[PDB]
Amino acid sequence: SGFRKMAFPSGKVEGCMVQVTCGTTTLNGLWLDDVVYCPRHVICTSEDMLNPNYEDLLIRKSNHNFLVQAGNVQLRVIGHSMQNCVLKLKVDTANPKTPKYKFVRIQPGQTFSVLACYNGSPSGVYQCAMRPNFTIKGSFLNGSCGSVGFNIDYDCVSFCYMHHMELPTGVHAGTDLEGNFYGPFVDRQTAQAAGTDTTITVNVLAWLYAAVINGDRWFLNRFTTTLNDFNLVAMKYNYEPLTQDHVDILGPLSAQTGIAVLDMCASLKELLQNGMNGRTILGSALLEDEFTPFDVVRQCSGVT
């Protein structure tokens, strides 16, 4: 028993991290097979970042201008190209540590682990959720660009995120591994509105089931509700509307605990309307939304 914000073991991803330097900028790259992926802003200087013309800036660059280092060995760059906001540096050597991998575009509300890196070296790992507004509330410093988010399915790493920038509000923005930004963000130093965020209802409910599984049952009540009645409460408290698809994904957790989904919805309704009354749930004094129903089942069953 116990419930923690658990990240995937980062080993397979650590073996892919490289340092990419272009001119005076150094950031992280992901070396998979004979290709190194990194944010395209590696080709800019502080003068360029207000409104960069990436096509023009990339034209002034040749293969020999991109310095790629894996630990202490230099990789030879034989090709370079830009795909959306990522650069793809073809190197002459396939990464011997390349794991079985996929590039996936995760959905808002889904979770993933981040391996924060500086100068191609891993510093730490943490679990994140892609916010409904397509930002991530990560922990990143200068030099962290190019650090990636991923999930692991037994031996396969699905890379879902590459870190690009911190918004003036302290939240983080980035791309999928094809270079497409999550959200409306662009890679330039400008004020950028992150949309209105909401709490991931299905994840909060999944976390309430995790609490029941781990002995925390104080919040359970004698009430039930309907999808319609619950959604009126979710509306008032900036929670995502709950659908039958969400109920269906909560099926395994409903079966494990013997607490019907709408009865758990009634517990959530009372917690939203009344607060916690100074009590805690799984060591938290607020409603946690960064655990999916899958994360809860995985952590409560032991999938390796």
Summarize as ranges the residues that interact with a second copy (CB under 8 A): 1-11, 14-15, 115-119, 121-126, 137-144, 166, 170-172, 214-215, 275-276, 278, 280, 283-286, 298-304
Q: Which is nearer to ligand NJU, 140 or 239 (CB)?
A: 140
* Cβ nearer to a second copy, comparing 5 with 105: 5
145 lies in the binding site for ligand NJU (CB under 6 A): yes
Residues 118, 163 contacting (CB under 8 angstroms): no
Confirm if 298 and 19 have CB atoms less than 8 A apart.
no
* Beta strands 86-91; 66-70: pairing state: unpaired
125 binds, among ligand NJU, a second copy, none (CB under 5 to 8 A by kind): a second copy
119 binds, among ligand NJU, a second copy, none (CB under 5 to 8 A by kind): a second copy
Binding partner of 40, given a second copy, ligand NJU, none, CB within 5-8 angstroms per partner class: none
Q: Tell which positions 164-223 bind ligand NJU, by CB under 6 A.
A: 164-166, 187-189
Q: How far is the CB of 258 from ligand NJU (least distance, A)?
A: 20
SS3 sequence of 115-176? EEEECCEEEEEEEEECCCCCCECCCCCCCCCCCEEEEEECCEEEEEEEEEEECCCCCEEEEC
Closer CB to a second copy, residue 91 or residue 115? 115
The CB density around residue 120, as the number of other CB atoms within 10 Å, is 22
| Residue number, 181 or 291, with CB nearest to a second copy | 291
Reply yes or no on whether 41 is catalytic: yes
Rg of the chain taking only CA atoms, in angstroms = 22
**Minimum CB distance to a second copy, residue 247 (Å):** 26
Asked about 145 being catalytic, the answer comes back as yes
For residues 36 and 213, which CB has a smaller minimum distance to ligand NJU in the complex? 213
DSSP state of 41: G
Least distance between ligand NJU and beta carbon 233 (Å): 35
Find the part of the chain contacting ligand NJU (CB under 6 A) among 70-78, 158-166, 194-202, 215-223.
158-166
- How far from chain centre, in Å, is Cα 156? 17
Beta-bridge partners for 38:
87
E-strand spans in 63-120?
Answer: 66-70, 73-75, 77-83, 86-91, 100-103, 111-118
Cα distances from 185 to residues 28, 141, 180, in angstroms, run 20, 19, 10
| Contact residues for 96 (Cβ-Cβ < 8 A; gap 6+) | none
| Token pair of 45 as six digits | 């200087």
- Which positions from 27 through 66 interact with ligand NJU, judged by CB under 6 A? 41, 49
Residues at the interface with ligand NJU (CB under 6 A): 1, 41, 49, 140-142, 144-145, 164-166, 187-189
Residues assigned a catalytic role: 41, 145
